[PDB]
């Protein structure tokens, strides 16, 4: 297959994405959830890990690490400590609102994903670290978890399989850094959401010091559908090493901002013009697209014409796939103001632990606040570039990377607009 997109409704994993059907247990079982879950649990951890490895599922959180290879890090005998699946439901990325839709509208799909994934990794329980701002979504998920306990689907003898498995929901308290997996682990442990240094990876030392896999809501909730439909079904979509379906959040300057499930390697132009109603003012009104939420560098209209929305084609477009959160910016956008607001986000959402982010993200925000007004000189552009390169790769977690990358994308694609901003400041203020 060479062309991708135009995903059929029979191949959707997240049916009832839009809240048009019953999210509760009767509606979930009438859509295929909790079907033959006992037969999945009784085929063992190795079969489930083989299905997830065969499916080509990569991490839907945004880095795209191979999910079966990641979950097989727990496939090892116990050493006295319990094992834990932890579901990352924080979702603090600007642009990204898909895990809210999974929790709010398909909650039993997430609970069955917790059960299947925790059986695959031998986990004792699931801690769903949900964002504290998602209060109605958290109570929604708790009603579904009560329905799953009262039906015997989780808990003591989950689905009649002889495997005991709890599902806990921990609410956040307003920190974007608490979606980073080790900072999330520290937030569950009752501390400041500061990321741990890796190694130890959480499969060695995770939550409470136990073996732990932190996995996104989307990569957890697709796993029962992967175990039922088969890994060869899920690997039949998208390009190679880019398998499956993906939730896309097209927001910003489109006619119809929406969340939509779509095949993996869909063109960005096809996605925007088909599901979002196109850019406001036509496709010729397009200035830039942040392809995968705030941490990915922007790409201009010349790149957006032919680019595919998977991991590898956006890496070749020197950006990232990320959370697949498409932020569309038309020609009327002050793009320096938008990227500087994004850097303002990253200094308000920075836990202050390590020196390059704690100091340099604030210093990049001050430089970007002067670049919006033009109150600068062009030698400070490359300077800012070097400042971003002194944050990238030198920090504890990738929030420093995710703050350096929008600066780098803005400089790389819009240096002349920065320069004409500064020179018109210089000619009307001197």
């Amino acid at each position: 297959k060479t062309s991708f997109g135009s995903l059929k409704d029979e191949d959707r994993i997240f049916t009832n994405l839009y809240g048009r059907h019953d999210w509760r247990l009767k509606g979930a079982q009438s859509r295929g959830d909790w079907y033959k879950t006992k037969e999945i649990l009784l085929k063992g951890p190795d079969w489930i890990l083989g299905e997830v490895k065969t499916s080509g599922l990569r991490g839907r959180g945004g880095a795209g690490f191979p999910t079966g290879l990641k979950w097989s890090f727990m496939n090892k005998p116990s050493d006295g400590r319990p094992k834990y699946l932890v579901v990352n439901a924080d979702e603090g990325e600007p642009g990204t609102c898909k895990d809210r839709e999974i929790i709010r509208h398909d909650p039993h799909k997430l609970v069955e994903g917790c059960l299947v994934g925790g059986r695959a990794m031998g986990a004792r329980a699931a801690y769903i670290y949900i964002r504290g701002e998602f209060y109605n979504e958290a109570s929604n998920l708790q009603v579904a978890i009560r329905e799953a306990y009262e039906a015997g689907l989780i808990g003591k003898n989950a689905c009649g399989s002889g495997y005991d498995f709890d599902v806990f929901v921990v609410r956040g308290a307003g920190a974007y850094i608490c979606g980073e997996e080790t900072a999330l682990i520290e937030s569950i442990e009752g501390k400041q959401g500061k990321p741990r240094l890796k190694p130890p990876f959480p499969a060695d030392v995770g939550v409470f010091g136990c073996p732990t896999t932190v996995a996104n809501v989307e990569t957890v909730a697709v796993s029962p559908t992967i175990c039922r439909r088969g890994g060869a079904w899920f690997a039949s979509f998208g390009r190679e090493r880019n398998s499956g379906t993906k939730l896309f959040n097209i927001s910003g300057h489109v006619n119809n901002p929406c969340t939509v499930e779509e095949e993996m390697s869909v063109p960005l132009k096809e996605l925007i013009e088909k599901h979002a109603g196109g850019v406001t003012g036509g496709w010729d009104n397009l200035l830039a697209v942040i392809p995968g939420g705030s941490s990915t560098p922007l790409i201009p209209k010349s790149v957006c014409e032919t680019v595919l929305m998977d991991f590898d084609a956006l890496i070749q477009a020197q950006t990232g796939l990320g959370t697949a959160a498409v932020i569309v910016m038309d020609r009327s956008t002050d793009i320096v103001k938008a990227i500087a607001r994004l850097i303002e986000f990253y200094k308000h959402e920075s836990c202050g632990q390590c020196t390059p982010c704690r100091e340099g993200v604030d210093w990049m925000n001050k430089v970007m606040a002067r670049f919006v007004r033009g109150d600068a000189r062009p030698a400070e552009i490359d300077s800012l570039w070097e400042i971003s390169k002194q944050i990238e790769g030198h920090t504890i977690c990738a929030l420093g990377d995710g703050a350096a990358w929008p600066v780098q994308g803005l400089i790389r694609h819009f240096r002349p607009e920065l320069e004409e901003r500064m020179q018109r400041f210089a000619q009307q203020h001197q």
Partner: protein
């Protein structure tokens, strides 16, 4: 730790008193500022014995090797968990 690499020979500190005019530190010890540098202990001992100086030798105190593990900050059942970070 770069100032802990070489051996030093100093002498016993003698009397420092107050200058009556200015309050300055007056001394009558010529050897009060004499600090000699040696690569080994035996070179310093040979130099002190060669010059008739009665000496006392303190052995080099190296810091013993520590067992450092960042994962020990987050143990399951040990007291070495950090309460904050």
């Amino acid at each position: 730790v770069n100032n802990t690499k070489k051996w030093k020979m100093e002498f016993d500190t003698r009397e420092r008193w107050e200058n009556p005019l200015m309050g300055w530190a007056s001394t009558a010890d010529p050897l009060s500022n004499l600090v000699l540098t040696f690569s080994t202990k035996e070179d310093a001992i040979a130099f002190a014995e060669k010059n008739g100086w009665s000496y006392d030798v303190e052995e080099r105190k190296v810091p013993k090797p520590k067992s450092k593990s960042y994962g020990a900050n987050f143990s399951w059942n040990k007291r070495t968990r950090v309460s904050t970070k």
